[PDB]
């Protein structure tokens, strides 16, 4: 149950903003407090929207 | 500037900064922070949350009287 549904929307409309990507950290829980022990993988069209 | 228009896309409340600028629909009405600062008469010297907070206040101030 960690698929956090985000406001980014398919069909452009909302693009994947970087904040949405890092708000994903809560669902990890205490696991994600650290930041040095987590690895991100973004879809290509969310790297073009992170830009 | 076109507050009346943005009311149709996003209703009463304005989403968070990250989302407002990531919707393709609102890129016609207001594109990027430069526009925000040039229109509010603010400057790059004013930090962006100040420009956004000012934008959010305008959005509320203007809501059609109901």
Which residue of B18, B23, B24 is in closest CB contact with A19? B18
User: Coil, strand, or helix at residue B61?
Assistant: helix
CB atoms within 10 A of CB B18: 19
**Structure tokens that stand for B24 in this block:** 């393709």
DSSP 8-state class, residue B28: H
Spatial distance between the Cα atoms of A32 and A13, rounded to a whole number of angstroms: 29
Residue B62 CA to residue A47 CA, distance in Å, equals 36
Name residues whose C-beta falls within 8 Å of residue B6's C-beta, 6 or more positions apart in sequence. B14, B26, B29, B30, B59
Q: Does A20 touch chain B (CB under 8 A)?
A: yes
Counting runs of H as helices and runs of E as strands, what totals does chain A give?
2, 0
Interface test with B, best of A13, A23, A49 (most B CBs within 10 A): A13
| Residue B41 CA: distances (Å) to CA of A48, B14, B32, B37, B38 | 31, 20, 15, 6, 5
CA B9 to chain centre: 12
Phi/psi at B17 (5° precision) = -60, -40
């Amino acid at each position: 149950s960690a698929k956090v549904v985000t406001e980014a929307k398919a069909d452009g409309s909302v693009l994947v903003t970087a904040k949405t990507i890092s708000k994903l950290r809560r669902k990890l829980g205490r696991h994600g407090l650290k930041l040095s022990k987590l690895v991100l993988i973004v879809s290509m069209d969310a790297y073009y929207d992170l830009l | 500037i076109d507050y009346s228009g943005l009311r149709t896309i996003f209703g009463e409340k304005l989403p968070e900064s990250h989302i407002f600028f990531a919707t393709v629909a609102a890129h016609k009405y207001v594109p990027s922070y430069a526009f925000l600062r040039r229109e509010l008469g603010l400057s790059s010297a004013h930090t962006n949350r100040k420009v956004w907070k000012k934008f959010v206040e305008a959005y509320g101030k203007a809501i059609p009287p109901a």
